[PDB]
Amino acid sequence: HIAEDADRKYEEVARKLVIIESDLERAEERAELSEGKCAELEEELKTVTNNLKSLEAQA
Amino acid sequence: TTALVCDNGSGLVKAGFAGDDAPRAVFPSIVGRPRHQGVMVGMGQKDSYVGDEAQSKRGILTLKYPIEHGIITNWDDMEKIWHHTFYNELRVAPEEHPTLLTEAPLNPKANREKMTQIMFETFNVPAMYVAIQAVLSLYASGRTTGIVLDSGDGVTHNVPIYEGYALPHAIMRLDLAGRDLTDYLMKILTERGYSFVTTAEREIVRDIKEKLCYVALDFENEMATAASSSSLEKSYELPDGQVITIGNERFRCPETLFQPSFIGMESAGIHETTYNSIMKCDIDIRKDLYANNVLSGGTTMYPGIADRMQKEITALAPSTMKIKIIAPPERKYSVWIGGSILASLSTFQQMWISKQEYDEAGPSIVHRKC
Amino acid sequence: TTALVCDNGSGLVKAGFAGDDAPRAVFPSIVGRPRHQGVMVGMGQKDSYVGDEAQSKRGILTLKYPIEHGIITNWDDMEKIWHHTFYNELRVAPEEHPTLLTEAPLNPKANREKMTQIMFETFNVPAMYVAIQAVLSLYASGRTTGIVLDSGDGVTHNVPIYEGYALPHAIMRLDLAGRDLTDYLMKILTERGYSFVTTAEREIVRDIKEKLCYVALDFENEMATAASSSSLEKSYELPDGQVITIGNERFRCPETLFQPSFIGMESAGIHETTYNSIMKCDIDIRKDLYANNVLSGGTTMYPGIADRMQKEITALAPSTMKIKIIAPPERKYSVWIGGSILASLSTFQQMWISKQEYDEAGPSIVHRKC
Amino acid sequence: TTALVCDNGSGLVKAGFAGDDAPRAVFPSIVGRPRHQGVMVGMGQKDSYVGDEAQSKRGILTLKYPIEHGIITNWDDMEKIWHHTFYNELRVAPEEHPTLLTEAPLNPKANREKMTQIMFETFNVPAMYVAIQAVLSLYASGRTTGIVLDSGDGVTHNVPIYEGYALPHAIMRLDLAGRDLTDYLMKILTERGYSFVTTAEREIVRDIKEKLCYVALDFENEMATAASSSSLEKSYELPDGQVITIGNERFRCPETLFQPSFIGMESAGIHETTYNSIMKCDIDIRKDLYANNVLSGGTTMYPGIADRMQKEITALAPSTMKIKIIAPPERKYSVWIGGSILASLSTFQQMWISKQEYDEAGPSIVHRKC
Ligand SMILES: Nc1ncnc2c1ncn2[C@@H]1O[C@H](COP(=O)(O)OP(=O)(O)O)[C@@H](O)[C@H]1O
Ligand SMILES: Nc1ncnc2c1ncn2[C@@H]1O[C@H](COP(=O)(O)OP(=O)(O)O)[C@@H](O)[C@H]1O
Numbered sequence A: 001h002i003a004e005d006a007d008r009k010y011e012e013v014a015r016k017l018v019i020i021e022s023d024l025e026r027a028e029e030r031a032e033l034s035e036g037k038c039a040e041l042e043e044e045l046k047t048v049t050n051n052l053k054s055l056e057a058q059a
Numbered sequence B, C, D: 001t002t003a004l005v006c007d008n009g010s011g012l013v014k015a016g017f018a019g020d021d022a023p024r025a026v027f028p029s030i031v032g033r034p035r036h037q038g039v040m041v042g043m044g045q046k047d048s049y050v051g052d053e054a055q056s057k058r059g060i061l062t063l064k065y066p067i068e069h070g071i072i073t074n075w076d077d078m079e080k081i082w083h084h085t086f087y088n089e090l091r092v093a094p095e096e097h098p099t100l101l102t103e104a105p106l107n108p109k110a111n112r113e114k115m116t117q118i119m120f121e122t123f124n125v126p127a128m129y130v131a132i133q134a135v136l137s138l139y140a141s142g143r144t145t146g147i148v149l150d151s152g153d154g155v156t157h158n159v160p161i162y163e164g165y166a167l168p169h170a171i172m173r174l175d176l177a178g179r180d181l182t183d184y185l186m187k188i189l190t191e192r193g194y195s196f197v198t199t200a201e202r203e204i205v206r207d208i209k210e211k212l213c214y215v216a217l218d219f220e221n222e223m224a225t226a227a228s229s230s231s232l233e234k235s236y237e238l239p240d241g242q243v244i245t246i247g248n249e250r251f252r253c254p255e256t257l258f259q260p261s262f263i264g265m266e267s268a269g270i271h272e273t274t275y276n277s278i279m280k281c282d283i284d285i286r287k288d289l290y291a292n293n294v295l296s297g298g299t300t301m302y303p304g305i306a307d308r309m310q311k312e313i314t315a316l317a318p319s320t321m322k323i324k325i326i327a328p329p330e331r332k333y334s335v336w337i338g339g340s341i342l343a344s345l346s347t348f349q350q351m352w353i354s355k356q357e358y359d360e361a362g363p364s365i366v367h368r369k370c
């Protein structure tokens, strides 16, 4: 009785584990893409700051 | 000087000396009186038999319990039972031993006042004290934190305790116990043809309950299984021959603990009152209460009650907590064991109610301070 | 001989030795007392628990802060907390160490007088000194010029400094801090169904605040976004299971720092009081004040607070100045770090208030010279 | 066209027409379901009984309140109760009447959203509105300034008003009310021998509370007096004969409002939360708040509660203010009376939430605008 109890319970544990794992790797993809996005924003900001200081010296 | 521990209970007296591993005297809390005539001159018939002497002359006596639902409802019979316990079972003199009595929570004050008055006046104990059965059960379990479910013969109660602090607003007391299950079994056995109506027959049915009944992990499919095959049927032999065979009654009798609607009560099962008592406690201690459900008393001795209890509470509690039902193999004497441990402590010897304090304050000393 | 630094604060004690890089002991400034009964005889009941021992037993205790708004309002509890800090956490003898206490600006004189009297009498410190939190924060930031916004658990204050000169007429002290945000969050969570009323539940809500709350760069469109989608919802798990999920509360809680009308206060947000304290200074130093806003304290630790602060001050200041919000990653311990630096300076060893000066001058010596 | 006023409450439904002096229908907010078998073929057994029909048949029913602490926790039962209120008690058609519902302050938003959605969809009211109980109580008291203390069956709350302006940051809500006093009395009566466990027995105990309980002016010497003599003992007769007599329980039950630690709560008494709500208000209006404490609701109907309240607040407030507890003799229906007054005003007929506004904005309009 207790054996089949724990067995079904922990097979469902492996179920939520597969789900939480899928969400984990999806969040890893999210993390890497967000690093790339903030890196693109970093080059955006470096470029715009160079432009700002150059053109402000001009002004 | 050693002290006495006298866990009374509504179905079984368990007495002994503080410091032992187990009670020295365990006998039914019962007083029998003869019904029939008595014809043999010179037989020397007694007026009333107590304890297990009334259990062997069972056939000619009418048996009465002086404790109904944790409450002493016949004080002369209770005096007889205490006199027996002291002089014939323990064979001591109560004038030379402090006595530790025990009581369920949430029952009238006159009960404790009369206990104290009886002890001090008609037994001349040097001191006494009235503990709570659940606290002693926790002492015996060897922990200071947990929600103990005590279920004896008259009353079922939960007491949540944390770090040695009781939560008296979350104590929940229920009034179905071993005796109501015995009565429900006496009533449920009539649908197979067996008819027990006498008090002696009630004792027979109690023995049937203690020997053949168990708790089903899943009640519905267990019912269907018993309906399909006949592998659950066992046989019992009454004390005159006449074997009887019972089927689904085996697990329908203790199922009442989880569906008290079988006996027309409105309460919830023991699993649900345990969960409610937990959810009535402060949110920071209930995770440690969830993992220290201590079981105690005789009515918690059915095979499979811990598994069903854990299944039910697990189904109720959040899916992250670790539900642990602690069911020792000797939980029928946990109250007495804990009482002996308590009465043996050195730091307890100032908690007694001395005779002089009683002489000063009256019987009201008991709950007013101790 | 080394000296002690004892940044008290109204939510956390941070103590250590002058010369270290970080406080050696960091525990809640709290004192708990049992509210429930206590049944297990011999459990060794303590009268009161302090520090983070009272934090683990908080299920059965009633917690109290002896400091309300930077002011010590319970001197017995504060003496308990200091005794703990010296003997159990740091494990030293206060008779062998000068002590550097810390205080917020613009709070009653009796506070410092009682501080120094307590030290010199019931601890027999060889010498002591009471600094200002913002000055020490500036020491730790490695500057001599800037307007420092300190925001702890009880009080928020700005202190503008220039070349090491304070402008005491421009000091502005505000009385909403971490604790008022915790209370506002306790009140805002009720509109989702969650009810926290106990002091222990106040600690739970404080942890929710420290884990899930952030400052929105633009409050209105953030509000509309949270109303549109549900991507802002995080989930928290209380210490009994019972996952809760919060939505726009995450940024509605710390937004009170910028709109103190949410808790029914009449003041202006921290950005506006910073700008006002700047504009109360001489027109020559405020260009250097605009570029040295030094954030400090625990309440300045929300994600996105530096950017919102910069946006707001930029919108207020002239369109030519360079607003720079300096927010170190360790800014929660800047006061203690600066206090250790200060107490380690060799030129400081003449600024102590020696025991003999106190014996000559009474407790009034503290503010009268030092 | 006339409008409906439907003060719901957690223990009693009070309905009627806007413009009357008293509610037309007052019945318990309770739904009963049969508990037992049912053997008489053709009796025409109903599925469920509501209102006070479920109260006279309560011997065979299990009663359930669909509102626990001001929150509606069973929406089918609440729909049954509203259907009953409209069709059998008032005997109207909800399609022809605006409806003014009422709600306690500081409770979840889904409550009001579901209220308005239920009304507009399953009753097709032309318009509706959800007021706050304390504001209506102040309307009925004939005032525009005062701190009203409402105390019904589920929740006790203070709302301070000045000149018609609410101070939403000083609103204090507490969750002990009539029902928790009923439960505490059910628990305290067991120490005399009486055992009430059923829901019908809970109704019996509620009536005992409404008939025999009062608030002691000085709790300690009242306790000593009840201990000394026996003149405080009254007698009550259950609905089967079998009289019971209660002593100090009479004033120990409502005393819980002033010491909520009796039921294991950590909050302060109603006097202290009233004083705190006042001291949370601007220093200029609190002199006028001290003199306009308006008592409302059923739980404020104990004899001697106004005197005890005034004594306590006078002991707390400065010795120059004039504390005036305003306790009307009809204060149990103040919320409904004020609701009728409000729904009768000409300048109110633009504050309704028309069906068209709901059709445009969804159920979320109820708090977004009104
Ligand atoms: N092995 C068992 N299985 C099931 N029930 C039992 C068993 N032993 C005792 N009981 C029940 O326990 C009751 C006595 O338990 P006990 O703990 O002694 O009660 P009390 O403490 O009130 O005397 C009896 O009514 C009996 O029905
Ligand atoms: N990571 C965090 N995010 C948001 N708030 C925080 C964080 N850490 C601490 N706090 C807040 O800061 C307060 C403690 O800050 P601290 O600087 O120690 O105050 P004090 O100096 O008065 O002790 C707490 O009330 C808490 O609400």
Ligand SMILES: Nc1ncnc2c1ncn2[C@@H]1O[C@H](COP(=O)(O)OP(=O)(O)O)[C@@H](O)[C@H]1O
Residues within 6 Å of the ligand: D008, D009, D010, D011, D012, D013, D151, D152, D153, D154, D178, D179, D182, D206, D209, D210, D211, D297, D298, D299, D300, D301, D302, D332
């Ligand atoms: N005369 C009375 N004395 C004391 N308590 C009363 C009295 N009448 C009613 N109550 C209490 O008031 C409660 C009902 O009050 P009411 O204001 O109708 O509640 P609600 O506003 O939630 O409907 C009941 O629980 C009852 O215990």
